[PDB]
């Protein structure tokens, strides 16, 4: 027997058994008008407030519907959330909870997971030129909990655009032309460059992220 086991920040999805009792409870609870508020409150009971952030996280967990058309165009059905704020604002706590509650979530830090670490890259294995799936490919149909987004290298954040929008990773390297599928929802937390958000300065100065990434 082989049992794939779910562990935090691993490719194995965490499915659960739904009894008829559980489905009945879900159906009954969905009838309430305040169902969105009730669910959103339950995401982070420990964290005080941030109710709009919790609602956004819940919507991310639900996700959207990706659309595929006849001509071949693919329309993104995943929503990405970025949190920028002062230190000790419980952003890392929310990221950790998202990692701890999603069916398939992958946790990365700022620069520990480089551009090679994210997406994917050829390993050039001698047994030849195998492809190794990085974080985002392994997080297909899942969430990527990037922490300290601001510390990320510019080069690292260059490679993230295609995964964010087209949801594909194109290798086109060393004679290997491949388009891996990376349909991942990205959530990131990053402090402003000046340590604390500056009301006197415009948000463009504080964020310092490229306009395309925002």
């Amino acid at each position: 027997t082989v049992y794939p086991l779910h562990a935090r920040s691993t490719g194995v999805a965490a499915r659960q058994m739904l009894t008829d009792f559980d489905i009945r409870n879900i159906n009954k609870l969905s009838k309430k008008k305040d169902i969105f508020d009730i669910l959103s409150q339950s995401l982070a009971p420990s964290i005080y407030g941030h109710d709009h952030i919790k609602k956004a996280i819940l919507l991310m967990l639900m996700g959207g519907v990706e659309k595929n058309l006849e001509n071949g165009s693919h329309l993104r059905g995943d929503i990405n959330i970025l949190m920028v704020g002062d230190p000790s604002t419980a952003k890392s706590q929310l990221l950790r909870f998202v990692l701890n509650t999603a069916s398939l979530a992958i946790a990365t830090t700022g620069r520990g997971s480089s551009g090679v670490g994210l997406t994917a890259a050829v390993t050039t294995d001698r047994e030849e030129r195998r492809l190794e799936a990085g974080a985002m490919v392994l997080a297909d149909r899942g969430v990527v909990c990037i922490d300290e987004f601001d510390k990320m290298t510019d080069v690292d954040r260059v490679a993230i655009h295609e995964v964010m929008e087209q949801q594909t990773v194109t290798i086109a390297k060393a004679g290997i032309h491949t388009t891996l599928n990376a349909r991942c929802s990205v959530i990131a937390a990053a402090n402003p460059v000046f340590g604390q958000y500056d009301v006197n300065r415009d948000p463009h100065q504080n964020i310092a992220l490229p306009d395309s990434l925002l």
């Binding site: 165009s73 693919h74 329309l75 295609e162 194109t170 390297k173 032309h177 388009t179 599928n181």
Partner: protein
Amino acid sequence: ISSKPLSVRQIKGDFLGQLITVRGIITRVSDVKPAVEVIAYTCDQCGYEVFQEVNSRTFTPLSECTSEECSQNQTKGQLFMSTRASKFSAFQECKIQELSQQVPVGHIPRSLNIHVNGTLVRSLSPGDIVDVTGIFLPAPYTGFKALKAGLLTETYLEAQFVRQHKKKFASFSLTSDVEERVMELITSGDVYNRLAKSIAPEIYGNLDVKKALLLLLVGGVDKRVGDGMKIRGDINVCLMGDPGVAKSQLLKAICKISPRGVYTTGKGSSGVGLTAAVMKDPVTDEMILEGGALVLADNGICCIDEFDKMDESDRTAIHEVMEQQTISISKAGINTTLNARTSILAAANPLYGRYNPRLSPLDNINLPAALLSRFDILFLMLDIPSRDDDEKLAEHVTYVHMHNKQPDLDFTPVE
């Protein structure tokens, strides 16, 4: 069952020996080399031609004429090989790969070997998307003996019939049926505008860019005067513009219509995708050069995305690719000049992301005067909000989402 095309993962051990159709991309194709079916030896002592069948990767020659007389009489005839008298066959060890649609969630594509034999050779080229139909035959295990546990078998697919999903441009014959489908298009009237609006119908209001992309697909005329001057004869389009104006989706649409074209993007990955270095092919032991993305996109469209965020080293090669249609390499181990006739389509953002009208266009496009000269058309595609066009786009997109089809009722998007 042979009708249904199967992904590589679905070719289990059950299907061995049957006639199956595998659908996927072709990555590596070997050169055509003579494969021995039956090797013919000549024994001049008894004047007999003896033929030894060969049915493996290897074999062994003979020493004693096994024909009746030399084995029977005291005469022991020496036998010599004859290449012209022996039987050969054109052979090619291709390698098909799984598509992105067929790969399940979280896995990576896996490959299956194809042994193209006979007159079917040279019917498969790298980058092709085909449904090869063949016989899933087993072969004796070829790996390390320690890992062997029982009669392990390596498997391949002996190709029988090849169907191309996207027909090559160089393979067009005006057969009566193609003639009728074509004249029916002519009689539709306004073929230029209909074809322009046809590409990527889900995108609204960007029609001049669609016309430019259609011109890019059609291509000009290469001129080679008697002296030796060669003009490019192909268009190099750029799509500089603000974020969120559907440049990447236009590029992907063009990739869909175009028969050959690589969607090279970003940085770092492109660094080795244009190097074209040298490596040894497993099948023939030939030190074949490997082509990069641009060579694989020969006579195609290079669809370079995120042009501005890509390393200057590759832009240096893009210079020569755009102008001379060839790549000159003089690095260690390689002293050749690759032939890469390509039309480059580039999508990029201006300097400082969103266009700043205050800065001059040249200061904001950021392209050097040499590189910008090679672009036949350089669109601006600036995003300028307006209460009318914004709601037009919003209605178009909402219709596209609510029905998976372009909003225009009367329009007919050509297949």
